[PDB]
Amino acid sequence: MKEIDELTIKEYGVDSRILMERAGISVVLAMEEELGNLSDYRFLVLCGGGNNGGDGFVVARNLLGVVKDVLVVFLGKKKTPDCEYNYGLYKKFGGKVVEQFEPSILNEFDVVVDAIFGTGLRGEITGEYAEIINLVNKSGKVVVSVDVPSGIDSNTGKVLRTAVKADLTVTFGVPKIGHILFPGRDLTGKLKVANIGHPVHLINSINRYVITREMVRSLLPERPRDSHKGTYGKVLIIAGSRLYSGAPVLSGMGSLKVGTGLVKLAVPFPQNLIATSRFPELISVPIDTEKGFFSLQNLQECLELSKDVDVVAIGPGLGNNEHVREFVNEFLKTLEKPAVIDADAINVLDTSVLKERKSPAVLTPHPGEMARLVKKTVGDVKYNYELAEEFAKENDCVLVLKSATTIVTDGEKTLFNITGNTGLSKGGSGDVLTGMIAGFIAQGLSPLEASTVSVYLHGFAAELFEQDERGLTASELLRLIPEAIRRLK
């Protein structure tokens, strides 16, 4: 985006003062839309010396004479050319500025506009900038942040020692990674993206996007009326163990609930019988095992079952021991079908095997599993989209790195999913998602498309739960899926 500001100025010829004005007045219209008529409020605008503060000066000037009271507190040491220009205008229009912050100055205002730091935040907020932000966070006033809540790193969504907690954030052109990833997404409050005059070609040239309803609607496969089971594809799920008899059922219904024609489960006997007692629409093939877990002795049976299907999901409830490790790795090495790889299949995976496969793969790790898979700490991999990108690119796969915001990348294209709620923070929830992905690949979506549609609908089904989210279980989620799909259209 800083690159897109530059090109719109330097190559397209838009005066930077014009971009600055459009930004400021965007903030005013966005506040009007949220608060209704602005004339009864008193505004405290906090302005740094950079262009974010310049945007604030523009905001402050456009409230002059229209609202109860305005006051700019200027916190910077020096002003950029556009901030100076706009400070010059605020003052000529009759605006009050001060350069001293008093703890009790919040008492006299209803709304605080936070235009201290934007995308030009480098390093940690200390000193009076911090005291001021802490004071605003304590005040209970309505906070509107310009571009990004000051103190959010707009590339990572990390808090640089302290950050403003906004009720509304108005950003320009496109959402920034820091609005989308946590903790920054939490501090952004309600996000509005204002068009401030950038040519549409540049806005679209951005290469990381949020997954939207319109995008998932345009990727949903067609259901032509003259169709049969086979039109909508076949999936094999290799899953479960004597410890984890539940996973296969949730995965298998994940696939069916998204419109797959046939799902075959391969689960050790007698645990295979669990699935068909819940959902007799499933096929649940008993695999004979020595101790209740898959091993190399089941390799040939499973490649055979894989001949008649379009995609294979593997991992949920398999268990993690040396015999499962041999079996999964020999299996994926030999399977010449798209693989969706989850849970324990990820925990025992040899990444050399992903390289040597001609057929595609989606991996769906949570950050715990990602940490173990690349031999890093959870904190190093969590919300790390560049690492996810290198992993996908180096291993020729799609990586779906699950969290409150999920990253879906293939190494070139990176998408962020923001649907969902904390009800997905319990067991079985990932098992549903593995199914949904496998099912959509079976219906002819590519691995990346399959993954994009699935994370979105998975999250959206959670939001449709009618009672409190914390009571949501994977079984209820399965029921909500077709509602999520209906509501897409």
Binding site: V28, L29, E32, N37, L38, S39, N62, V66
Partner: peptide, 6 residues
Amino acid sequence: AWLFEA
């Protein structure tokens, strides 16, 4: 109110 008088 801010942008338009009707």
